[PDB]
């Protein structure tokens, strides 16, 4: 991983991407009965899934011990599935695609208590997405990085492998952001422009990582245990057989 | 504040520098009788007042509306107390300084339900910060980036007025971003090493976020009025007349 050059980092994060997934819903049936965070919930469980295949495919991340993959999926989940969402959208102005068969706006998100607030927030982001122009190649760069920063301060071990396994981290973390600047200066932005617009780019993981947090609460305020992936259900997914 | 040089940008954020404040307890007094909740939020009442007189000297912040510059203060003062709190604490290791005169461990932070694991969410900033040998220029420069950036992206308003001030806080983010790297340029740091330290001190951005939003969900768990600032107060105190 670490020796990887950009070309090559890109290549790999575009190989590992996972599949844009379809609701579960009767198309053939009235729209009025089934439950919009049910089919948000399914969604949600589907894709968690395919995030895990995803994550072992990105440069570094099985080069780490299988307790701390599930630490980085445990914090990162939302924020992954929330930077997708926005990235799928884009192209789609006052709507948010959960699906190509889900194209909700912002009036949809009001049947439940607290979503329009979220639903606001993802459709600003993807917004500043079409303001910045950004491109597949720099989305991908963006949902590495989360997968690897957000859990890298909360380890709460400092044991001789924890050290060893935040310093690798940050090292995968400086290779993205020596790709990022690849692409950029490939794009034929001035260095100026360079650090201007990955400071730009990075700085939305910030509200990124805000609207994962006012999800959280959304979905602990629920208080079900079919609700939230638990450290086991993760583990259980990442812990593979050969 | 657009044509500021970096070398001005960098002067007027150091100029800009609120004080360090005392805790008010009895320090002839017994400590166990003392309230930490209590002394913790009488501090923050007061860091409140010289937080929006810093706002108001940093670049561009004055050139917004006061709506807009209320909105920026209320999704960003908590953010800002933390990164100042990491900030003091960060020649001390495993302890918090709130004050020159109450440095605490994270053993203290036992006595209030929920209070150690933002505790240790701190302490493991503080640690980064070590680990990065943060620079106190630098530190300036990120503190006024949280001010601007963490509430650009909700607004939720696309006014001609809106349009224009969210160019402006772009515009002079990244100014900032201009002045950090000629910050590291200045201290012989290659250009992939200026692009690395820029991704990695932004990044820890997300992370002072993340225990913003888990600070705010204590504060509003407390169910008070005398708890977290009203919209109106913030108005009030950055309402000021001449
Ligand atoms: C309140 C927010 C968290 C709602 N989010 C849902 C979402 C809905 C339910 C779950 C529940 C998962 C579980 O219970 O395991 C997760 C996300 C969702 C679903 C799929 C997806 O691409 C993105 C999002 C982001 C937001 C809308
Ligand atoms: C649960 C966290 C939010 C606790 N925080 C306190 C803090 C305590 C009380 C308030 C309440 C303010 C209010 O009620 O207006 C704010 C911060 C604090 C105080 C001063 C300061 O430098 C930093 C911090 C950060 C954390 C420890």
Redesign the pocket.
């Known amino acids: 991983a670490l020796s990887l050059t950009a070309d090559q980092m890109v290549s790999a994060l575009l190989d590992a991407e996972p599949p844009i997934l379809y609701s579960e819903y009767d198309p053939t049936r009235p729209f009025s009965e089934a439950s919009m965070?049910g089919l948000?919930?399914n969604?949600?469980?589907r894709?968690?899934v395919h995030m895990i295949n995803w994550a072992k495919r990105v440069p570094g991340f099985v080069d780490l011990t299988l307790h701390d993959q599930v630490h980085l999926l445990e914090s990162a989940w939302?924020e992954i599935?929330?930077i997708?969402?926005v990235w799928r959208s884009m192209e789609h102005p006052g709507k948010?695609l959960?699906a190509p068969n889900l194209l909700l706006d912002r009036n949809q998100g009001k049947s439940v208590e607290?979503?329009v607030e979220?639903?606001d927030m993802?459709l600003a982001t993807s917004s500043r997405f079409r303001m910045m122009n950004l491109q597949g190649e720099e989305f991908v760069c963006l949902k590495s990085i989360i997968l690897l920063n957000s859990g890298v301060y909360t380890f709460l071990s400092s044991t001789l492998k924890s050290l060893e396994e935040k310093d690798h981290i940050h090292r995968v973390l400086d290779k993205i952001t020596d790709t990022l600047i690849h692409l950029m200066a490939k794009a034929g932005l001035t260095l100026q422009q360079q650090h201007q617009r990955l400071a730009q780019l990075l700085l939305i993981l910030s509200h990124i990582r805000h609207m994962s947090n006012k999800?959280?609460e959304?979905?602990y305020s629920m208080k079900?245990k079919?609700?939230?992936?638990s450290y086991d259900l993760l583990l259980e997914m990442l812990d593979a057989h050969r």
Chains 1, 2 share one sequence.
């Open positions: 965070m948000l919930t969604l949600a469980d894709e968690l939302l599935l929330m997708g969402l948010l959960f607290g979503m979220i639903f993802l999800g959280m959304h979905l079900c079919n609700v939230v992936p």
